[PDB]
Amino acid sequence: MASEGPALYEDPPDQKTSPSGKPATLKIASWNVDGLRAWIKKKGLDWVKEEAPDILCLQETKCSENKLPAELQELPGLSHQYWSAPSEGYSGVGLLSRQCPLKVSYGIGDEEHDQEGRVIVAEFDSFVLVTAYVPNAGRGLVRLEYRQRWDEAFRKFLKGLASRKPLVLCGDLNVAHEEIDLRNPKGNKKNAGFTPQERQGFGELLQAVPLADSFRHLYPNTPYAYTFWTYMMNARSKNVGWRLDYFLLSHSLLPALCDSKIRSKALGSDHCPITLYLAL
Ligand SMILES: [Sm+3]
Numbered sequence: 001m002a003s004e005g006p007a008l009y010e011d012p013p014d015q016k017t018s019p020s021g022k023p024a025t026l027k028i029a030s031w032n033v034d035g036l037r038a039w040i041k042k043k044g045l046d047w048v049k050e051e052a053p054d055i056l057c058l059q060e061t062k063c064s065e066n067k068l069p070a071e072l073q074e075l076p077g078l079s080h081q082y083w084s085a086p087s088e089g090y091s092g093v094g095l096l097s098r099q100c101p102l103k104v105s106y107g108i109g110d111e112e113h114d115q116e117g118r119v120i121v122a123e124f125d126s127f128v129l130v131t132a133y134v135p136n137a138g139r140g141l142v143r144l145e146y147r148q149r150w151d152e153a154f155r156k157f158l159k160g161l162a163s164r165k166p167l168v169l170c171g172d173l174n175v176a177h178e179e180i181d182l183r184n185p186k187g188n189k190k191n192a193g194f195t196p197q198e199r200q201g202f203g204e205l206l207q208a209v210p211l212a213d214s215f216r217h218l219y220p221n222t223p224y225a226y227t228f229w230t231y232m233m234n235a236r237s238k239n240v241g242w243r244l245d246y247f248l249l250s251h252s253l254l255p256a257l258c259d260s261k262i263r264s265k266a267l268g269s270d271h272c273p274i275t276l277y278l279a280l
């Protein structure tokens with residue numbers, strides 16, 4: 001039945017200097033934790049402590065802002081913590097930072113799309129950071145029409161932000177852009193995450209803002225690089241996954257891009273974390 005066996009992928013070593021030789025000054029980690037409490041129970045924070053990022057973005061926290069695990073109070077290097085949950089138990093995002101942002105905002109300015117705690121905007125001196133947990137198209141694509149409306153509203157919102165300050169977007173964008181972004185493109189053409197509607201949406205986001213796919217920019221032809229594997233069917237051991245997590249940057253930030261990583265070995269969720277190195 002299934003045609004996939006193991007496909008090897010070894011993320012290359014961390015490139016910590018930009019094309020001009022400037023060492024990375026900013027390290028950002030993004031991770032769909034599939035439940036903040038479950039993830040922490042699975043020692044997610046031990047990985048964070050070792051990675052020591054300047055900023056940590058989390059998606060799918062599924063946790064009430066008033067029920068945050070006490071273990072989060074043990075992250076000395078990430079004392080500035082912000083969260084956003086649905087207008088409990090689902091969706092939700094978080095953003096933890098070493099340095100205090102100039103301003104933090106929630107949502108994308110559209111009431112219809114701001115009730116499920118999917119976006120946090122943190123403005124810094126030289127750039128604005130947005131982390132998002134994009135709405136899934138759903139089983140049977142029952143939420144694809146809504147997803148298309150979200151895609152348009154999100155694209156417009158981001159273009160607005162980027163028109164004033166360099167932008168960095170990270171998170172679970174719930175879509176594998178190209179065939180190279182998932183192990184089984186032929187069998188998922190009508191499934192959430194790989195529909196023409198979703199893929200065209202991602203392509204338009206890149207063109208309209210405009211934004212560049214950091215990982216693909218550096219590794220244009222590298223296959224089998226995924227960030228999500230279903231917990232079922234022993235998918236992760238066979239590397240039958242999807243690259244749903246990204247770091248999209250304004251073109252003006254490309255000269256500061258050092259590396260965009262996929263931490264394939266970090267356990268604790270059905271998604272692995274991704275890390276960005278910028279020389280700002
Ligand atoms: Sm999940």
Ligand SMILES: [Sm+3]
Pocket residue numbers: 178179
């Ligand atoms: Sm293609």
